[PDB]
Subunit: 417 residues, 4 copies
Amino acid sequence: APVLGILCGGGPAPGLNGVIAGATLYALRLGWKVIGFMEGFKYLCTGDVDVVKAHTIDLTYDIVSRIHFQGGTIIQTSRANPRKSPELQENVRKCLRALKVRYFLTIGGDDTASSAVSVASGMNGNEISVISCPKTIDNDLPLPADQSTFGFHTARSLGMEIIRNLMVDSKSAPRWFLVEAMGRSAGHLALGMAEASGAHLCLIPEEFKQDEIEFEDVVELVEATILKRLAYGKNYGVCVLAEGLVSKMSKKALYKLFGNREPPTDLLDDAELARSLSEELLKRLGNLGIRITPKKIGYELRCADPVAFDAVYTRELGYGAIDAFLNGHSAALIVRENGQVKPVQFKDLLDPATGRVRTRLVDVTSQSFKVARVYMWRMSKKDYENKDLVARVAAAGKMTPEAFTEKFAHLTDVVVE
Amino acid sequence: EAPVLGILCGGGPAPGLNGVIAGATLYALRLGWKVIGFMEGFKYLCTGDVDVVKAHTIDLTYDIVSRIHFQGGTIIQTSRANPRKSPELQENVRKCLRALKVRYFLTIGGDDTASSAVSVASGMNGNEISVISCPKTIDNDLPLPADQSTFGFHTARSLGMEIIRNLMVDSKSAPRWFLVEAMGRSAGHLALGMAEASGAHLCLIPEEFKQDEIEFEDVVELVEATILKRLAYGKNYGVCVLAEGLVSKMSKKALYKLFGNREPPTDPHGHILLDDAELARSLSEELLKRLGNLGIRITPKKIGYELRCADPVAFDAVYTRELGYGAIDAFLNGHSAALIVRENGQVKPVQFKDLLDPATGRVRTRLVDVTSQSFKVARVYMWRMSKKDYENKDLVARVAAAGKMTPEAFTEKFAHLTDVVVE
Amino acid sequence: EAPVLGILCGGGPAPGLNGVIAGATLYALRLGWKVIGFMEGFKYLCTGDVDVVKAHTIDLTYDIVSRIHFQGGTIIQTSRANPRKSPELQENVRKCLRALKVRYFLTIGGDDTASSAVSVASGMNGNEISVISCPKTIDNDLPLPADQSTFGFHTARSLGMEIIRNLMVDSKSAPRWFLVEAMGRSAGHLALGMAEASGAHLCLIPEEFKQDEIEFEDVVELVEATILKRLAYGKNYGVCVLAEGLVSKMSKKALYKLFGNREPPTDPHGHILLDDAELARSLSEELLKRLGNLGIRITPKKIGYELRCADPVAFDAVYTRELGYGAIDAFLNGHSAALIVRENGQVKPVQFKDLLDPATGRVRTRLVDVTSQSFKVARVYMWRMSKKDYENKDLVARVAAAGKMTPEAFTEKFAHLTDVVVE
Amino acid sequence: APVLGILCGGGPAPGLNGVIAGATLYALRLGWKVIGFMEGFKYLCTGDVDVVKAHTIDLTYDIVSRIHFQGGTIIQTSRANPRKSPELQENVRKCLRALKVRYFLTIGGDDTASSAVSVASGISVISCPKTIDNDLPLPADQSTFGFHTARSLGMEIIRNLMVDSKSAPRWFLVEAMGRSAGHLALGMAEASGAHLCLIPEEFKQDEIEFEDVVELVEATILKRLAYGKNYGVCVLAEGLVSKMSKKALYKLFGNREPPTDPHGHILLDDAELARSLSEELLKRLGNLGIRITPKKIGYELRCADPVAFDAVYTRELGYGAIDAFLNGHSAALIVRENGQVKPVQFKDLLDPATGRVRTRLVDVTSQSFKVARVYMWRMSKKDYENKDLVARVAAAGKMTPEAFTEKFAHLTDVVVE
Ligand SMILES: Nc1ncnc2c1ncn2[C@@H]1O[C@H](COP(=O)(O)O)[C@@H](O)[C@H]1O
Ligand SMILES: Nc1ncnc2c1ncn2[C@@H]1O[C@H](COP(=O)(O)O)[C@@H](O)[C@H]1O
Ligand SMILES: Nc1ncnc2c1ncn2[C@@H]1O[C@H](COP(=O)(O)O)[C@@H](O)[C@H]1O
Ligand SMILES: Nc1ncnc2c1ncn2[C@@H]1O[C@H](COP(=O)(O)O)[C@@H](O)[C@H]1O
Ligand SMILES: O=P(O)(O)OC[C@H]1O[C@@H](O)[C@H](O)[C@@H](O)[C@@H]1O
Ligand SMILES: O=P(O)(O)OC[C@H]1O[C@@H](O)[C@H](O)[C@@H](O)[C@@H]1O
Ligand SMILES: [Cl-]
Ligand SMILES: [Mg+2]
């Protein structure tokens, strides 16, 4: 019987198990034998077939029949990337040939899909066929606008639930939370949690007009929101900050971010955007009775059990992977577009400037973004021109209307309106 | 003085109603509008008494609506009171809306509610009142672009998946079959959504039956063949999801059997009382007579009222926020007799007449498309006897033996089911 | 080689079973023991065929059990196969346990399961096998010190509260009364727990009735008085929780009305089939006849099977970890024919004789103590007509008016209920 | 009619609304008038009766009928502490007499109850035990309300981190909020089957050393590594920080002088215990294939909706508060023992040495703690004496058995065994 081998690469996203079971269950009805490599390419990279066999498992009906309820990956995952060396690619080729893998399904990001493509291009097209299923919780794939990636709905819904608790706590015991949403690729996740939870502010890198962000501008964008709320009698709130703001910050901004010290180097993961902003905002606003606390939302989302939307989603993706193999496809991506799962060649989706799959960011000109912005607390262009409002907000911050305008009015050219 | 926006809810609740109320109210308040909410839909506007209406309307203020986007239900309640059946009632609603000086009238409800709103408007000056309705249904039966859901549907489906998950674990731990009846007779979207998400072993919806009228025996035999096939692979347990809409497709003879070989009940005016039907219970009794001797136990379970007012999931919190906004946007843009709907990520008003089915005069009902790719995928992961399966003699012998019957007896009893449902 | 510990589950599942399996297994593995698990309780041990038993036993290894403390249900399944009724079966179980060289035998189940384990033990030498059972019940009906719960009860109560919350929001949003029937006829702990936690407007348990047999009319009237009193305060909706055990206290005449003025159903052996009763539905139909004219709609809802295999809450995860440990500790200390129970924060073995009720031969049933302060507190926050209320002429006039009847009629009809239930 | 005034003090806990609703509903059936002071003692401490009047609300039936489902507190809370000054204490009395409060119910932790009694020595005063830290001196085995909810949600969050730690091999250092005691950290850890839990109660000496904490985590990671597992979750009580010596705090803050408030007291809130330990352990263990990430669990627990156990608990506590008022009790705490709610005089609960409410910590000699410890991964005394085991672990850490013994064996005198 033909052998289908499955592995996962990259970080988990809710629904991985749904893709594994969707492919495996359908393949088993066709009489296929299904195996799963543990920890992605980690052990295939050694080329030692005994080591690979000690870290592969038989994906059977009993194993996969009920994993569609569970977050995580039953075959685990890794960022092992055989593409960096030609010897590693040939090790993976040597182990896949040894196992008689006819169909090769990888579930991972592009680094994972590219590894699959590298191993295949140096391999006869009649012995092995290779398909990758693109996974990302960041929702940054180039699908038709408003169409989500699998695992995103789960990550957003649980994030909404955590922020709900922080909104209740911020009101019950007046304080501001700066919630840093993990993920530096795009602003989909931070804005999704913020809009759903009715957070009072959301900052994403996509809304900044100039190419590089300055630390002072981020502090003042949050500062103006806190003062405006205070002008309406509210000394509390929640502001959600996409971690991707950090990767748009200038070199000088990163120097201030790390405590006016030299930034580490091989290192954006050591940055604490929400914490740094909290320290700065407390000096400026503490005298007004404001307390500010950072909170990170990230790792607890990756392996939450999938919500129904992602359970249906990943079942249809697993099916479509087997369907593509049957139709002779290879070097393709299983994606869902306009309700149809279909294979799409890797090159059809690449951005020529990057060599990586094209990244879809938040469209800050769309109506969805402007609607989210309407329900935020912030000072618009029109608001700065309203002298009754500007006087009340300035007074809340114990500064003159001229001082307030002098400091904050420029922010309308910092971010889209 | 400031224009008055009045809001009411009609029909049955769905998760996200409060989100539409908060989106409309908060945006309207930033425009300086005054916002009021009628309690229990058209119930008191139908009386024409302005004192009764005022005793059952409330001022929708910032503090009231600021944090209801987290909460299920309706803070202004709802009702099925329907003024469209009478011109005196329509004129009563007009008399009370004029009295309260409602400039913008937003109804959040089903088809009966939207039709009532337009009827009340056609006898009104287009410069004094403007009317917009927001379409609500957990049944997902609105004529929207395919695969795009109505608000509250995602919440109802996700909670339904979680409940069935408990029943799937319970069915395996203590071998048994559950016949889960999903509430809703309009369409099969909800039953099929929960089943596919939960990996249930079977789903039956009215849309998959070819003939115009379903027979009780056919439904019994579709479940029976599934139980036997699982039993042929050593599994004496499972979950089967049944859309309540199977009942409303059943023939006269099938309904007589459904109600216990009794005359089907009827209301004063002559409508058969399908709410009193107990589909899952009736089928369980029959399947237990046939299969209990094989070691099969079957139990019915209904999933319905606990879904309607669950707190909205994030998808519906965003959805209903954009709808509440879009209603205010439609008022500002001079629209009236329109329905706020979302299409390809864009909220826009769509005229009520544009959505009607010309043959019926009512809004067209979107059912499950059983020819689509999504339905064929759902069907692959179910346990069932397909056309090809009935031709596989090795399989038919294994299943027949599980049911303690000859292979010819099995083929004679169940094989006709391939002409009952689309394959 | 290493001592063999065999584990099986009997009876209906309860949240935390897996926690007991993992607590016992992990500790035993640190001791160097070999751990096996029989699938579906005594079902295959009853056959006596050792090949069949081996085909339905599994090696409980570290990797199998390391992360099952999060999961509801039981990974080794369960069954009600009861070898206690036959020694031919008991000796089959003995034959398979000797063949597998089970030194330590742990059963997690109800009274039938614990009794079966001891019967298999009384016919073996005390040196070759030691037997411990962990008593399981989601009904909280074990004779532990008062206010101390059985494992799985906290989870079932908390999930039941969550379901009723959705019904409380739905009952207010779309005015209606829900009759929530909590499944389980043993006791009233579960129904009262969900009701008190959720602030339900009424709860009826068999324990609060003074007389030995309940009458159908009295149950109807106790709910009816609550609906009328709420109606007198402008609320035409609510939730009432009914313990299913009301059915098992009903008189012969009461059961005749319950089943539709028919003879109660019966099994082949003549015993009555109370599972076919629909307590909430029958009361709903009757209450609709009496109160529908007042604007009341009433709907039944069952809460039962979705509770059994919910994932355990933290209280039950810690609880079942301590029980699994205490079973291994009891084996190590030479105990046998004992029950692992937790009392006053201490897990300890308790000999079978300490817990049996001599009248039954089965474990004693702990019911709700309706004289306790906890019950009086729960009763304070319900909507109901007390002794004092019937003597308050101002109140009786408003409630009577809500029911469109004279105060003389109301007192004459309902006043006797103060001798029906404890006050 | 008599006036019952209700306030909340301290940090929020799930079930606050349940006590407000139980007390208010029962009091209203008695014909009482019920008012709620906003933000605890914040405004009563000013002595300005005009300000207090602007921050009190009438607790009515429609307000409280359905808040037993809701986390947080509708009358908010604060840590305003009239106990620190006699001038403040008389301010609270002046405002309460002005409002003619006959019955005064405070709902709060140990800090709150001590404030309540100070106001009383000169109206009837009752306090209800609140704290997710479970650190009130209640009868043994009886929890404070809100503890069950905080622990159950904490278990659920850690479950997601456990699935993520195995799926994408890594160690999470979960910092559980609360420096008072170890109840919360040990509860979440035991329920979630976490691989290690460190609480201040298990340390023998009066002062913890930073190196000892690092090494307690290090030995657990190496032992797991000796059994083929390069991942896990370790739960750390924040109270480890408040036991650390002056030198341990210097290393904790980055070999900095610890921050301090204007009075000379150290600012432990600025400490990042889990983050600091992660940095140190990554330097030592990164080469072995170990990744370590810190995660804090705290503020998202405080205002979760109450679980059924806390809903019933706080319903009975609110009732018992009114019943104590009816029976003439004062300066008492409503507590539950053996299913009976009863008032317990405040003097019975004082620490003769401290004058403040006694703080109940984890009893590390109890059977519950010994069982929890059995299911952890750690090196006991007997384990350090097992030469076969010591060789296996030492090899996992790429060190000789002599090096391992010299570094780690002393830890048996650092923590109870
Ligand atoms: N930036 C903002 N975002 C959302 N709502 C706001 C904002 N500013 C004011 N509001 C609300 O808009 C309404 C109108 O404010 P005003 O024009 O000051 O009466 C009030 O209910 C405010 O709370
Ligand atoms: N109707 C069905 N739906 C889903 N899986 C099935 C169905 N029928 C058989 N299988 C599974 O498909 C695989 C192939 O079985 P076989 O037909 O014996 O080769 C086995 O794992 C079966 O349990
Ligand atoms: N049976 C009951 N259970 C709980 N609350 C009640 C009940 N009857 C009346 N109440 C409430 O108790 C308060 C006092 O009512 P009254 O005695 O009419 O002034 C009001 O808030 C009523 O709604
Ligand atoms: N510190 C520990 N805590 C819990 N389990 C352990 C610990 N150390 C070893 N184990 C497990 O206990 C069993 C006994 O291991 P061994 O003594 O090496 O045979 C194996 O399943 C180990 O994985
Ligand atoms: O055989 P089991 O253990 O009952 O598993 C049921 C499985 O049966 C199939 O219908 C589905 O494809 C699976 O998703 C489902 O879980
Ligand atoms: O060894 P794993 O796969 O990491 O499992 C983690 C286990 O580690 C142990 O500490 C516990 O006994 C288990 O309850 C826990 O789940
Ligand atoms: Cl075996
Ligand atoms: Mg404290």
